[PDB]
Structure 1
């Protein structure tokens, strides 16, 4: 997250870190046994880390649970990033409390102008590299589809939305991928892609979760 603020420990209780020896992507806990992330975060050998603030220090609220199954969306296209969504089943159920909690799936899609919360452990610089150890947060609005398509001609599908600031300076970034965009207490987006980070006229692009609720629910019910 570029241009954000330190969230505070366990203030984003649905945020998870995906670990394969190191943090490589975010995700969101949607019930005691399932996480949603970006398909472009797929790899084998995932450990899901819940209850994290500092990802390099054991602070006492963590739960570390291995994945038993991963399911990339049937229509994910790695060249265009259309359908950039993946489900991960945990080997055992997490213990839910105030500091580790699920986030609700949306019943309706959010409109442009809605303010959302984006979070992650990704790069904090637009030029160069500095990775934080504690969770960072950013409040940002959903942008109109017209502004999104004007910023990225030929690249925005109906399964994507833009959020952020056209003036630059505030955005998600590498290492935030897979993490949540929460608006009015519902998971509306997944950190997916963008051109650089925090550049003028290049806002972040997010997977539009409301298009996937039926697939998520049916997949969880049968796996």
Structure 2
């Protein structure tokens, strides 16, 4: 997270850090006690599926305090239309082996109804992106959880204000841009999977998920995020049906 602040402890309660073989992978958002949304790309290169942990209530990587709860991740589900190393459909649903306990420092983010996401929340200006990922494009990853407020753009604008490049991918309908084209503020690598959360009347809801960009806070470029609302019905089906038996599951999309 480039050009943000430390999230004051407990004010980003739905942030997950995902670790593997001990080391930082990604972030996630907690949608209820066993369900965490991330990005699918976070899982392209995974070896030890066994040691895929999910930490909630965390804040200072550097020091163990009260409030961290870790949990094995029993299943990663990625949409069936997601192709490794491509930008489209960058979303995952993680089932934990055991509920986390809701506490002041672990609280879920609402997954809104689609037509609330689409007609209302998509036109609230700012929304917070957070993580423990790189603090400058090629720089050091954070230790105290980073938060950043960004503005959302409609794809038409994101296409008008962006310096073109021979193969920066399409902004598809499962994507959306937000941030700044002036180089100051963006989300970076290892923020992937983390929340873009939108504040409306007094409750936070999940509108987008950290995904991809050209570098971080590159000039003439915006952050790209998975439009979570194109996925709401699919996630919810998955949260409602009977556990299937894999670590990696490629569930159908739409």
**TM-score normalised by the chain length of structure 1:** 0.95
SS of the residue corresponding to residue 146 of structure 1 reads: helix
The number of residue pairs the alignment matches comes to 222
Distance verdict in 2 for CA 1:144–1:94, change over 3 Å? same
Aligned to 1:13: 13
SS of the residue corresponding to residue 218 of structure 1 reads: helix
State how 1:63-78 maps to structure 2 within 5 Å: 63-78=69-84
| CA distance in structure 1 between the partners assigned to 2:221 and 2:3 by the alignment | 15
Q: Deviations over 1:187-216 (max 9, x none)?
A: 001100000000111110000001100000
State how 1:55-134 maps to structure 2 within 5 Å: 55-107=61-113, 108-109=117-118, 110-112=121-123, 114-126=125-137, 128-134=138-144
Aligned to 2:177: 162
Bigger radius of gyration among the two = 2
| CA distance in structure 1 between the partners assigned to 2:89 and 2:181 by the alignment | 24
Distance verdict in 2 for CA 1:81–1:154, change over 3 Å? closer
- Structure 1 regions of 5+ residues with no counterpart? none
Aligned to 1:28: 29
CA RMSD of aligned residues (A): 1.4
Larger deviation, residues 90-99 vs 151-160: 151-160
Aligned to 1:216: 235
Q: Is 1:183 the counterpart of 2:193 in the alignment?
A: no
- Structure 2 regions of 5+ residues with no counterpart? 244-254
After superposing on structure 2, the runs of 4+ consecutive aligned residues of structure 1 that deviate more than 6 Å are none
1:147: Cα distance to partner? 2.1
Asked whether the 8 Å contact 2:179–2:222 carries over to 1, the reply is yes
| CA distance in structure 1 between the partners assigned to 2:77 and 2:188 by the alignment | 24
SS of the residue corresponding to residue 89 of structure 2 reads: coil
Q: Is 1:2 the counterpart of 2:2 in the alignment?
A: yes
Aligned to 1:52: 58
1:111: Cα distance to partner? 2.6
Q: Deviations over 1:131-180 (max 9, x none)?
A: 22110110011012112234267511000000001212100001101100
**TM-score normalised by the chain length of structure 2:** 0.84
Aligned to 1:41: 42
